[PDB]
Amino acid sequence: GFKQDIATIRGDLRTYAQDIFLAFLNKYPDERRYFKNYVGKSDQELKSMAKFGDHSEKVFNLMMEVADRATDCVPLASDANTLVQMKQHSSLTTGNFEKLFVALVEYMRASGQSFDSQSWDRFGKNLVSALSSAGMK
Numbered sequence: 001g002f003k004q005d006i007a008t009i010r011g012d013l014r015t016y017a018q019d020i021f022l023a024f025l026n027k028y029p030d031e032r033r034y035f036k037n038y039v040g041k042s043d044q045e046l047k048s049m050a051k052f053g054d055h056s057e058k059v060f061n062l063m064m065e066v067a068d069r070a071t072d073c074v075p076l077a078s079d080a081n082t083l084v085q086m087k088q089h090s091s092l093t094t095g096n097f098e099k100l101f102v103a104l105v106e107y108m109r110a111s112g113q114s115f116d117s118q119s120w121d122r123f124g125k126n127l128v129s130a131l132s133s134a135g136m137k
């Protein structure tokens with residue numbers, strides 16, 4: 001289930017973090033505008049960039065912590081507040097996060113592994129709700 005899925009992802013994090021981030025950017029190519037130097041590149045070109053894998057890894061490091069600190073897929077209010085207050089996240093709305101979770105859930109469903117997809121959907125939605133309460137537009 002959800003808790004196990006956290007260990008699963010953490011066990012092979014760089015691969016999972018990149019595969020899922022790439023699924024997100026490929027599902028929604030216009031999200032690349034929030035980042036630097038992503039446009040004009042294929043998955044492999046992205047994966048060989050200096051900072052791409054390292055970035056996706058940090059994102060998923062924190063996501064897994066947030067999911068881990070959650071109860072019944074409900075994230076802590078303080079974890080949401082951190083995501084809202086991050087300088088790197090200042091121009092974002094909750095829509096950006098729900099897109100990431102849509103891509104994440106779809107990735108899980110398409111893969112071999114036995115992810116509790118519905119739980120990640122629920123967590124994604126609960127996180128979006130908490131980001132709103134924390135003041136994100």
Ligand code: HEM
Nearest residue numbers: 031034035055058059060062063083088089092096097100
């Ligand atoms: C649960 C969801 C998310 C988590 C846990 C998360 C986490 C992070 C972390 C930890 C960093 C900084 C890494 C570092 O200091 O090197 C970061 C940076 C950043 N994030 Fe997120 N993020 C999330 C969602 C998103 C989404 C959906 C977007 C945009 C569509 C986004 C846009 C950015 C941007 C533009 C940066 C700065 C990249 C850079 O400075 O090189 N984040 N995020």
